[PDB]
Design a protein around this ligand. Structure first.
Ligand SMILES: N[C@H](c1ccc(-c2ccccc2)cc1)c1cccs1
Length: 137
């Protein structure tokens, strides 16, 4: 296995009625037709789970590009940093953001995520969709 293995994305939202997560260890192609759901206006964090198997790694970064119809791409880069090898997964969390709000803000956002580093290595790249709704259901 590679030294760095990205295993999971979770949306951390205390107001959500259940877990919001995606296993990143398998068929990433299937994520493109799927979606995860946030109630409009919800406060959330993106949490990336990853393993460091053998060697200290440095310069890790999480890059997230969000696409919404009629809008230019919303690009955000988050410094993840340096991690040593250990059996248990690490979790990196972004700062809190607020999900969009408004009937016209609802619906699909297409995300492209990169777990990478200062040397531009592709630890994992994946697409996933977010659906913003008036209510959780
Ligand atoms: N600002 C919005 C935006 C909407 C949703 C998210 C998002 C991403 C991942 C998880 C939860 C929410 C980020 C930004 C825009 C995106 C593109 C054009 S406008």
């Amino acid at each position: 296995a590679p030294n760095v293995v990205v295993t999971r994305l979770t949306l951390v939202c205390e107001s959500a009625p259940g877990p919001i997560t995606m296993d990143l260890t398998g068929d990433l192609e299937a994520l493109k037709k799927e979606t995860i759901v946030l109630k409009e206006g919800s406060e959330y964090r993106v949490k990336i789970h990853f393993k460091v198997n053998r060697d200290i790694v440095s310069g890790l970064k999480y890059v997230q590009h969000t696409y919404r119809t009629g809008v230019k791409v919303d690009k955000a880069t988050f410094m993840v940093g340096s991690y040593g090898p250990r059996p248990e997964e690490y979790e990196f969390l972004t700062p809190v953001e607020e999900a969009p709000k408004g009937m016209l803000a609802r619906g699909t956002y297409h995300n492209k995520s990169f777990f990478t580093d200062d040397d531009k290595q592709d630890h994992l790249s994946w697409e996933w969709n977010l659906s913003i709704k008036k209510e959780w259901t």
